[PDB]
């Protein structure tokens, strides 16, 4: 039992309700990839999983409406403490329960001549205040449109009465349970630009090979005639700058090396779960998976 343990470091650049960025370092690539894959496919969420339609008289069909209901994000903060519905002793009645199986209701009808549309804000939930439909894309944020996710549009003699039952799942069963909506990381470069080759070549060539960069990585400091890296984190590893340095024949001018550490994450969220809660649930599910695979019972 030796040490055999590397010591990570976290430092956060930005953090909002549905966004994050942190400079994780001193850990290997496989750990960062494990965090990414757990946050995309392993972290659970409550979503609609069963639909009973009593009346449907719109121009859409039943599976279209059920398919649109399955994708509406529900706020899932008690989903880590809920249970998979195959693992529940009770609730064999196709209805509401208290450790799974939240029940929803929906009814709408138009009697005017104004083309009523049925949105997500007409779904009324039993077991309230714990899993409603999501509102952060409407209120608490002035992003696009408070009307929310349109389901059907209707006319006079048209109506829609149904009852949906949400459950618990993970992203490997269907895409409706995945709470990620962006999880990615990247390396960060080590740029070691020479100064004894840069003063050789001429000023028009300087302003040319700065111009060949597709993202603004370098900058041209005209007051000292020199160049300057002003943003390493917009480099996208396409080698066009060093390729034009190769075509201009000036080798040893710049060299670019991805560092082994220093993985800049960028985490978004559908709004079912907060961002830091996603990261912490990922670390907890990795600990549960590392717990369930030990052979500590028989040492020899």
């Amino acid at each position: 039992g030796a040490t055999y343990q590397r010591f990570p470091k976290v430092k956060i650049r930005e953090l909002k309700d549905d966004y994050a960025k942190f400079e994780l370092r001193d850990t290997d690539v496989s750990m960062a990839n494990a965090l990414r894959r757990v946050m995309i496919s392993e972290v659970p969420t409550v979503a609609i999983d069963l639909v009973e339609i009593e009346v449907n008289s719109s121009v859409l069909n039943d599976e279209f409406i059920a398919h649109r209901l399955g994708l509406i994000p529900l706020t899932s903060e008690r989903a880590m403490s809920m249970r998979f519905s195959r693992d529940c002793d009770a609730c064999d009645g196709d209805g509401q329960c208290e450790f799974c199986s939240v029940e929803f209701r929906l009814s709408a009808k138009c009697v005017t001549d104004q083309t009523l549309d049925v949105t997500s804000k007409d779904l009324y939930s039993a077991d309230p205040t714990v899993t409603p439909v999501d509102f952060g894309d409407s209120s608490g944020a002035d992003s696009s449109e408070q009307r929310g996710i349109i389901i059907v549009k209707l006319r006079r003699g048209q109506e829609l009465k149904l009852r949906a039952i949400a459950r618990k799942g993970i992203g490997k069963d269907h895409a409706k349970w995945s709470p990620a909506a962006t999880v990615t990381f990247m390396y960060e470069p080590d740029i070691i630009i020479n100064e004894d080759m840069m003063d050789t070549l001429t000023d028009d060539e300087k302003i040319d090979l700065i111009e060949s960069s597709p993202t603004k990585v370098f900058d041209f400091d005209a007051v000292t005639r020199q160049v300057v890296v002003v943003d390493p984190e917009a480099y996208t590893y396409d080698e066009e700058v060093i390729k034009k340095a190769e075509a201009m024949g000036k080798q040893g001018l710049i060299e670019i090396r991805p560092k082994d550490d220093s993985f800049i994450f960028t985490v978004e969220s559908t709004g079912a779960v907060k961002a830091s809660q996603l990261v912490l649930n990922a670390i907890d599910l990795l600990k549960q998976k590392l717990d369930a695979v030990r052979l500590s019972d028989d040492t020899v």
């Binding site: 509406i72 696009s144 059907v152």
Partner: protein, 64 residues
């Protein structure tokens, strides 16, 4: 027909952004300025809004 929830590639919810997209194009904006106004940075969602065919209206007219 209607706009799809959940942009097929990444998974951002776009199912509410249709009417504000029509209003931003109605005012005077071009499509790049409109998509930068709604805040869609990656092109997997921009291709999902710019190429949507809205066929629900033609269905609503031809019923009875």
């Amino acid at each position: 027909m209607i706009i799809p929830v959940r942009c097929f590639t990444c998974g951002k919810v776009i199912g509410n952004k249709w009417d504000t997209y029509l209003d931003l194009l109605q005012a005077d904006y071009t499509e790049g300025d409109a998509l930068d106004a709604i805040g869609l940075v990656r092109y997997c969602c921009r291709r999902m809004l710019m190429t949507h065919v809205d066929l629900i209206e033609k269905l609503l007219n031809y019923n009875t």
